[PDB]
């Protein structure tokens, strides 16, 4: 019971709820704020995420590789707030007003970096944050369990400000985020007391280096789940980022497409969330190339079901696929990798891969796709990718590793012992 009358968590908690908060907002509702309201072009809106992307690679390695060396010390994640303070004043008077004012190219990119106070962020947030209560102890796997209804709940009453006032939202932005988040800094806390006085004592590192990788680009077992990510990964998550102005025009009005797309979301995290505390061994008994090709045949589905939505309800259904395949995509992702690779390569894989190859593809994969939407539509589009995406999939049926090799009866044991 170290909670209810405990703070940081109670605290910690919090800071991690309202933020998720301004996740509700930002990413759901933003293709719509582009086309819906800066009469933004397909094309273009295209460069928008192409442009991300290199801020969500040319960051997180940055990122991600200081916070360690940060310490219990907020400073970072201080900085990051002095971003998410100033929401509004950005996005109405320098994001769009640079957008929309046509010079595109050279403002995307002049907004492309209140791009990472969410996706290199978010992370940059959440690990930090368990060092938090890793020390003044709980675990927080109660606590982002926590921070991940203000997403739900910030998304509802988004869509439907966002039609009482596409800009209401914009101040909620900062207010319902900077101020609380920021002074739910002042409760912070520190001081290393009765363990790891410094970053050896208790407490290790995970590392990574030059010649690890030089022994992943080595190893096969990369190469063909290197495709995997960079194949069907890459490629579904362009799917995603402007199936909203698909999913919009569908309905009767524009109150609905957005009062009701976020209506789903929203109404589609318990289905997520349920799923998952659930999920785990679902996989350790489906597998992992398997969980992970289970993730695939779906938004391979979800893709080419597009290219043929006659029917908004249609695209309400070809919605609740995505986040009932992010468990798999993400639970798989992982009881995969640490059962076919190294310990010691880990991190490393997290990199070669992610951090950095799916986000240079995407980055293109967005802009062929960002003109090609406006070839052949969205729907047709949608009838190019999906294909392709189910196309990997097939292959990486031969492509990934056994479901039981030579040694998972003595190269892995980890959750066993
Ligand atoms: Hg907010
Ligand atoms: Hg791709
Ligand atoms: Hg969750
Ligand atoms: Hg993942
Ligand atoms: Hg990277």
């Given at each position: ?71 219990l ?24 007003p640079?957008?929309?004012?046509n ?17 290199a ?5 959440e ?14 796997g ?12 910030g ?69 063909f789940?290197?495709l ?7 490629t579904y ?7 909203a ?5 569908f ?16 109404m ?119 294909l ?30």
């Amino acid at each position: 019971m170290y909670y209810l009358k405990n703070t940081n968590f109670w605290m910690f908690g919090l800071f991690f709820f309202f933020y998720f908060f301004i996740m509700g907002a930002y990413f759901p509702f933003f293709p719509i704020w582009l086309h819906d309201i800066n009469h933004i072009s397909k094309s273009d809106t295209g460069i928008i995420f192409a442009a991300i992307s290199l801020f969500s690679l040319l960051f997180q390695p940055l990122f991600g590789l200081l916070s360690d060396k940060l310490g219990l010390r907020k400073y970072l994640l201080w900085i990051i707030t002095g971003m998410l303070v100033m929401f509004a004043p950005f996005f109405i008077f320098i994001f769009g007003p640079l957008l929309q004012y046509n010079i595109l190219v050279g403002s995307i990119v002049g907004g492309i970096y209140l791009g990472f106070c969410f996706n290199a962020g978010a992370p940059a947030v959440e690990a930090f944050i368990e060092k938090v209560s890793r020390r003044s102890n709980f675990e927080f796997g109660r606590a982002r369990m926590f921070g991940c209804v203000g997403w739900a709940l910030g998304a509802s009453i988004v869509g439907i400000m966002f039609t009482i006032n596409n800009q209401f939202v914009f101040w909620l932005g900062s207010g319902c985020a900077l101020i609380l988040a920021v002074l739910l800094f002042f409760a912070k806390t520190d001081a290393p007391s009765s363990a790891t006085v410094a970053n050896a004592v208790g407490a290790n590192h995970s590392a990574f280096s030059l010649k690890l990788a030089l022994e992943l680009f080595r190893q096969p077992k990369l190469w063909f789940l290197s495709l995997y990510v960079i194949g069907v990964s890459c490629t579904y998550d362009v799917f995603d980022q402007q199936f909203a102005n698909f999913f919009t025009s569908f309905f009767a009005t524009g109150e609905q497409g957005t009062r009701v797309f976020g209506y789903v979301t929203t109404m589609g995290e318990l289905l997520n969330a349920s799923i998952m505390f659930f999920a785990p061994l679902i996989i350790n008994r489906i597998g992992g190339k398997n969980a992970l090709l289970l993730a695939g045949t779906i938004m391979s589905v979800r893709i080419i079901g597009s290219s043929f939505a006659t029917s908004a309800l249609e695209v309400v259904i070809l919605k609740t696929l995505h986040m009932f395949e992010v468990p798999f995509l993400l639970v798989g992702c992982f009881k995969y990798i640490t059962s076919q690779f190294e310990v010691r390569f880990s991190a490393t894989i997290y990199l070669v891969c992610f951090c950095f190859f799916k986000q240079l593809a995407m980055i293109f994969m967005s802009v062929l796709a960002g003109n090609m939407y406006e070839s052949i539509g969205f729907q047709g589009a949608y009838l190019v990718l999906g294909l392709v995406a189910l196309g990997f999939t097939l292959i990486s049926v031969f492509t990934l590793s056994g479901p039981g090799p030579l040694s998972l009866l003595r190269r892995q044991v980890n959750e066993v012992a």
